[PDB]
Design a protein around this nucleic acid. Structure first.
Ligand SMILES: Nc1ncnc2c1ncn2[C@@H]1O[C@H](COP(=O)(O)OP(=O)(O)O)[C@@H](O)[C@H]1O
Ligand SMILES: [Mg+2]
Lengths: 107, 93, 95, 604, 88, 87, 98, 107, 93
DNA sequence: ATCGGATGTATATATCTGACACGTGCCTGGAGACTAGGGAGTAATCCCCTTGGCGGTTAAAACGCGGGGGACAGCGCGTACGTGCGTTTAAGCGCCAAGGGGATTACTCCCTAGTCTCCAGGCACGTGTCAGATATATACATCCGAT
DNA sequence: TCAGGATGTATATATCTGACACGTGCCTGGAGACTAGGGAGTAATCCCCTTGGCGCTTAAACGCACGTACGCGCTGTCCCCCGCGTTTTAACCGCCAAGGGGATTACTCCCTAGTCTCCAGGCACGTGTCAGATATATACATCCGAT
């Protein structure tokens, strides 16, 4: 019969075959279920979509049409949930979030 | 050669969300590293979770528990909902 | 000419807006080789390795200076000092 | 005043002489006496031969008792001082049954064994005990020592009686903060300037180290069912006490089990009932035959040797008997919906929750209508027991019988207080909250000779025993209890000696619910007690409801009358989760969390 | 008289005073004392020592003699400062 | 009138002022302000919320209803503060 | 006049007496009540062991003691002797919890 | 023949068969060499002996002849080495080593 | 009901460093937990090392690298020295 | 307050170089049997945890007071930072030469692991005990706050 | 400063108990075959890194000099926090009742994974464009600082 990929018949965009292969050949457990790759692919797709939407918002805010590591940095640090999730990473070439302490400003 | 990337899948998701923007190579690499990091975090948590319960199988239940252990709050809620949606669609279809 | 502090706030605005590297390239790269000579003789590096090292060092020092500034403000000051940075590092589980 | 000739022959009181016997000098003088055990077993077999069941098993265990058994096998006036009158050395009179109790005590003494005194309440138990100790003093010439462990409440009463009917005996009670307690220790206890010590359950655990260091002639205990558990800390501690014999003054033993009675026996005579499984399998629960009532029932002959109780039903007479009026009540709509809600759901112990719903749904938080919160008939309007209680309270009030409510939850007492205030009756509440002085003043207020106290709330298992409310006429056990004698003591708070007029005691029951199961099991245990021990001594139109519940009670009495020992111990433990058909069985996130704005360069 | 290498400068001083000032500004400070420079050189040297030691350990385990960006990334992640962008 | 509770002051108030001072002394402070006794309750409540959330997640996954010492230990280890002893 | 110690000495004695013992300083039952109240966090009616609550109290007390040490350092840094909520907040911000 | 334990052969005290089983059953990798359990057992043995020696010294200094968690904490926290190894670890019933800031001391 | 533990072995080690001291049960549990924790750390680092270098097996080389990578300096020196001498004795015998 | 002045800030233009589209093949994911073992379900046992209530001891906790010493504002004041200007100096970028280091890429085998089959010998568990660590008391010697 | 108190700090003693030694059952670690595939060795091939240099542009870094404003020390002055005595109340044991929850220890069985064999499309790699984003000037507007 004609073969249809698990990504398509699950409705996702991330690969499910590759995720299943990594889960097997990654020494995570002896046996890997059949819904685990689907669930993991869905979660990864969701997180990617969320962060990319915020980054695109920032890039449009700065009158540009290409997301750059600066926009990734800026979106991540401005969203508090993503900031907690990525609290320890350092996006290379991201700069820093603009902030001056109130006391330092002139009278 | 023959190095797997996730670049094409991330680009598909981007052209779904913002169908007029693009990604530079450095941002693309950062996004790929992000996906790999999250994958290894979730998989490692699920592996330890199965080991704690004397199970020899990773299944969607362990994946879900690891998701809500790692992602904070609203992120966890939405990710769990989306994963369950995808799994039910897959099994039904 | 300009009142004190004006150029300081101007420089803070300038540098919190941009993203490039702040330490020179060759001085840092030379320092990395020199400090790596001790652990094992005749190592080779590569540009990507040294760039990753520099990027990490930049981020570390920037966060350290943020903590030091906040410490100095805590003590009713605007000038940062070695006591400030030592307190920051020791609180942050390093000293 | 004139009994001092008996005091002749006693040595003069002197701590130095007392220290010879009181302090047991032998550090590890504890040993198994073959002579005493042989005498015990010989007399025990002389009374009857059934006791070899324990002995042969114990011989199958450690054989240095098996050789004692062999010794007892190969080798094979003690006049009771009947005291036809009151004993001279006690100033006062003793009734004939009291005399018989005293003689039983003496006869057990001169047999190297003991016996649980378990007389009915009010029959001067402490008088028996003081008389017997005086017997040892004046006649047997052993002034002391003696330990008189008791509940904290009655310590003053024990001392008052001991100084009243036998003033010669010197005795004191330990009490007070640890400093003056230790002062009393160092001055008298180790000083040996006494004959009888009085302590409390708590103090025994507290001041045990000094009390180890006295050879105790006996170790008396007041109401003893406290020791019914042999893993209780008090039981564990009260086993290293080197002692000759022991006494276990109590009320009714065997309150909710048989193993309980085994442990209670094991305290007095460990060398006989040394094996749990022996008692647990000889005539305890088994599954053999009609033996249940053909033989093992008849095998009380093991107890009658050492146990006693004198039925106050006929040895006194005045308390007209009792009047039990169980009322089966049906659940109301709020109860229906709530009870189903628990059945298919902080809510643990579903069985406890079901009891709450059978009492008043307002116990559940957020059940009553409101806020704002009122106190009108919407209170009675949702609790069936409370509706019947309102009707019955009105009927009693027009008759004029002031009532005691013995609830089982103090929160239920709160709702009852609100209901009573809304109905303009007044009360006095006593529970695990009121301090002592509150309790005494409340009792006095209720027992004023002209007291305007209609209702008088309590909790069933509270107030100790000195609470005396014979002025009351009706007791409403709003809830039934697991242990039948718990409610028995509660409902004898009004039936106690001195009560003049016949009393009625209601027991509201929620039909077709847990309460029926609880009542069934409680009746199982009560009938078990009787067999084992007592033998070998909108509106509901209240009238038709009364008749229906009375018929139900007769039917269940018929059901449980004809059960057998092994059968009566079954504890069917029918699951109450299923009541009318139960199966042990108890989003899209469109939030799109947030999207910030102003990601441009406008901070400055 | 100059055959020897008498001419030389220490490498930690290559972290110039104004570079530390630029870092300080990006951190958001307004006045810098005179001893912050020496203290900063010390702390940077210590940090680099730790990271470089771990990276070199990885490389010599793999039987190599070049320290790769992936090895540095592994070393940082082990230190607890994971870094996105240079692969991995 | 009184069936309503009107009782049980907040459980965070059970962390009394002297207990905070004992913790402070073991930390090594000599003189204490007066608002420390509220800031401390806030921070303790936050910490407990996080740890208990993770422990309950582990317990629910194992299909139990009992939070066990090993569940708490796993939660703390995940949070990054290992606890030797228990389990 | 009755003997009275000047301010600071009883505090120093308490410091050196609590830095030498090892027992728990929060009361067991109040801590357990707090824990079970919080436990309506991501579930409803739940059962706890006893080792669970003991472990939880150990962790909490260690955390609070470390926090108070950092706070003391901040307060001394400000050329002060008293600890203040500003010190708590600074210390707990620098560590990375806020 | 006659069984001769791998712990005996290596000269260690800690079990090597048990360590081998743990490496195999923990799915750390597909195959475990024959010298890895020996090396691991030796390292664990060394660290245990080190910490126990320090704890015993502390116990003697406290005039006791039995290690307790307080002695373990004193041994760990006094040396700058096991303190760094056990940095994030809290020891139950450990207490804290005594120090008082010199500013707080009287004149 | 059989629960494996290291109590016997750490007690054997104790009785040759301080041959007269004992050890309480709580300290014993702490030591067992410490040994388990260190074992997990070393094994996990060795597993990740094997995964990094495409190898499929764990051996003494990975264990040595993990030790030298986790233990701080002067402690790791003695640890690796003693590990090597033990493994050489095993190989010779 | 106004004017000067230095400094971002929008704005049009040209450059280019980095993102995005398109064809190839090759290898991995999918389809289809086959099978075994993992996990779900069931029954029996036993110990811990729940809920509501009770009674007691007794240290901590709450409260009030008084007084002092520490924090917080003001006041000089005299540095040590800033800001600006002129001048070297070094970073960065090009360029030259020759090698080794390393990552595929492709066989080739050895040897060293996993797998199976017994089988005894480690080790965990269930019993005693007795020696160490308690708590008690007492005498002492040792800081602290008022001359 | 010295005598007057309050507080650890030792010393001696009776008690409790929980480490420690000992005996059994069993299960798993070790001996002994057999096997097969992972990894070690070899040997091409191309790209990057090294070590000495050289020439050139051009911003940053350095050094120097006013010269403020700020960090620091003193003084004052509240006022807030500590020490201490006095009630009181809440923790902490001990209890009681029933039942459920969680662990073990078997058993049973079914179904869902792993293991193969084929076989095609999906994805990576190598190309070829073109447009998004610089940098450069330019006029605009917009705080800042001295009269
Ligand atoms: N002359 C008497 N003869 C017999 N009993 C008496 C006499 N006088 C008083 N008593 C009763 O003897 C009782 C002994 O105490 P008792 O009621 O048995 O308390 P408890 O049941 O707790 O032992 C007293 O309650 C007292 O009422
Ligand atoms: Mg009595």
């Amino acid at each position: 019969a004609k073969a249809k990929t698990r990504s398509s018949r699950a409705g996702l965009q991330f690969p499910v075959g590759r995720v299943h292969r990594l889960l097997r050949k990654g020494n995570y457990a002896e046996r890997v279920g059949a819904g685990a790759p689907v669930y993991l692919a869905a979660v990864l797709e969701y997180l990617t979509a969320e962060i990319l939407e915020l980054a695109g918002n920032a890039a449009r805010d700065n009158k540009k049409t290409r997301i750059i590591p600066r926009h990734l940095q800026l979106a991540v640090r401005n969203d508090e949930e993503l900031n907690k999730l990525l609290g320890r990473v350092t996006i290379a070439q991201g700069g820093v979030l603009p902030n001056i302490q109130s006391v330092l400003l002139p009278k | 050669t023959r190095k797997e990337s996730y670049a094409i899948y991330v680009y598909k998701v981007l052209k779904q969300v913002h169908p007029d923007t693009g990604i530079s190579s450095k941002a693309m690499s950062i996004m790929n590293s992000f996906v790999n990091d999250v994958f290894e975090r979730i998989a490692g948590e699920a592996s330890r979770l199965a080991h704690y319960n004397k199970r020899s199988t990773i299944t969607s239940r362990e994946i879900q528990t690891a998701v809500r252990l790692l992602l904070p709050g609203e992120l966890a809620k939405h990710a769990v909902s989306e994963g369950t949606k995808a799994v039910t669609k897959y099994t039904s279809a | 000419r300009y009142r004190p502090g004006t150029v300081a706030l101007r420089e803070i605005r300038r540098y919190q807006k941009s993203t490039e590297l702040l330490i020179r390239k060759l001085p840092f790269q030379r320092l990395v080789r020199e400090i790596a000579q001790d652990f094992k003789t005749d190592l080779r590096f590569q540009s990507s390795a040294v760039m990753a090292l520099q990027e990490a060092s930049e981020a570390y020092l920037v966060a350290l200076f943020e903590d030091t500034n906040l410490c100095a403000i805590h003590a009713k000051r605007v000038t940062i000092m070695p006591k400030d940075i030592q307190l920051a590092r020791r609180i942050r589980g390093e000293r | 005043e004139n009994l001092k000739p008996f005091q002749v022959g006693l040595p003069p009181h002197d701590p130095e002489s007392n220290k010879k016997r009181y302090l047991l000098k032998d550090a590890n003088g504890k040993k198994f006496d073959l002579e005493g055990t042989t005498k015990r077993f010989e007399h025990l077999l002389s009374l009857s031969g059934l006791f070899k069941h324990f002995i042969e098993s114990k011989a199958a265990k450690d054989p240095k008792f098996r050789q004692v058994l062999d010794v007892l096998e190969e080798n094979k006036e003690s006049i009771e001082f009947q005291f036809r009158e009151s004993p001279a050395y006690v100033n006062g009179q003793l009734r004939p049954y009291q005399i018989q109790g005293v003689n039983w005590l003496v006869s057990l003494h001169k047999n190297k064994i003991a016996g649980i005194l378990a007389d009915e309440m009010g029959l001067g138990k402490t008088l028996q005990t003081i008389s017997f100790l005086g017997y040892l003093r004046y006649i047997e010439k052993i002034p002391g020592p003696f330990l008189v462990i008791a509940p904290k409440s009655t310590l003053n009463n024990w001392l008052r009686e001991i100084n009243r009917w036998t003033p010669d005996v010197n005795a004191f009670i330990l009490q007070g903060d640890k400093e003056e307690r230790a002062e009393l220790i160092q001055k008298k206890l180790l000083g040996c300037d006494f004959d009888v010590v009085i302590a409390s359950y708590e103090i025994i655990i507290r001041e045990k180290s000094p009390l180890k260091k006295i050879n105790w002639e006996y170790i008396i205990i007041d109401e003893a069912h406290r020791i019914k558990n042999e893993e209780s800390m008090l039981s564990q501690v009260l086993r290293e006490f080197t002692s000759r014999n022991r006494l276990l003054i109590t009320g009714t033993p065997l309150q909710n089990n048989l193993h309980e009675l085994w442990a209670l026996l094991n305290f007095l005579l460990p060398d006989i009932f040394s094996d749990a499984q022996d008692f647990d399998d000889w005539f305890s629960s088994e599954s053999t035959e009609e033996d249940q009532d053909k033989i093992v029932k008849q095998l009380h002959t093991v107890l009658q040797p050492f146990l006693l109780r004198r039925i106050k039903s006929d040895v006194e007479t005045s308390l007209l008997p009792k009047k039990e009026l169980n009322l089966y009540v049906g659940m109301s709509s709020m109860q229906k919906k709530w009870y189903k809600k628990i059945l298919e759901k902080r809510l643990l112990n579903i069985m406890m929750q079901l009891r709450k719903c059978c009492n008043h749904p307002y116990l559940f938080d957020g059940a009553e209508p409101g806020p704002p919160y009122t106190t009108d008939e919407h209170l009675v309007y949702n609790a069936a027991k409370l509706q019947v209680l309102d009707k019955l309270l009105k009927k009693l009030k027009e008759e004029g019988s002031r009532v005691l409510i013995f609830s089982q939850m103090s929160r239920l007492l709160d709702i009852l207080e609100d209901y009573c205030y809304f109905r303009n009756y007044e009360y006095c509440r006593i529970d695990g909250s009121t301090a002592h002085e509150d309790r005494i003043q409340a009792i006095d207020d209720y027992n004023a000779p002209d007291s305007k106290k209609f209702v008088f709330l309590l909790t069933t298992r509270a107030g100790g025993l000195g609470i005396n409310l014979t002025s009351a006429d009706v007791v409403v056990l709003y809830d039934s209890d697991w242990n039948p004698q718990a409610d028995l003591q509660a409902m004898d708070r009004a039936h106690r000696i001195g009560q003049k007029k016949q009393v009625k005691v209601f027991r509201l029951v929620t039909d077709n619910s847990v309460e029926e199961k609880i009542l069934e099991r409680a009746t199982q245990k009560l009938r078990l007690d009787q067999l084992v021990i007592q033998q070998n001594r909108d509106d509901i139109d209240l009238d038709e409801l009364l008749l229906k519940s009375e018929n139900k009670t007769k039917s269940l009495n018929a059901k449980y009358e004809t059960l057998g020992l092994d059968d009566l111990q079954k504890f069917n433990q029918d699951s109450a989760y299923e009541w009318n058909g139960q199966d042990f069985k108890k989003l899209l996130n469109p939030t799109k969390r947030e999207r910030k704005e102003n990601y441009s360069i406008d901070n400055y | 008289a100059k055959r020897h290498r008498k001419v030389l400068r220490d490498n930690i001083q290559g972290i110039t005073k104004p570079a530390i000032r630029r870092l300080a500004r990006r951190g958001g400070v307004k006045r810098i004392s005179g001893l912050i420079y020496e203290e900063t050189r010390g702390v940077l040297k210590v940090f680099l020592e730790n990271v470089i030691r771990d990276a070199v350990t990885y490389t010599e385990h793999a039987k190599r003699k070049t320290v790769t960006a992936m090895d540095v990334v592994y070393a940082l992640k082990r230190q607890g400062r994971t870094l996105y962008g240079f692969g991995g």
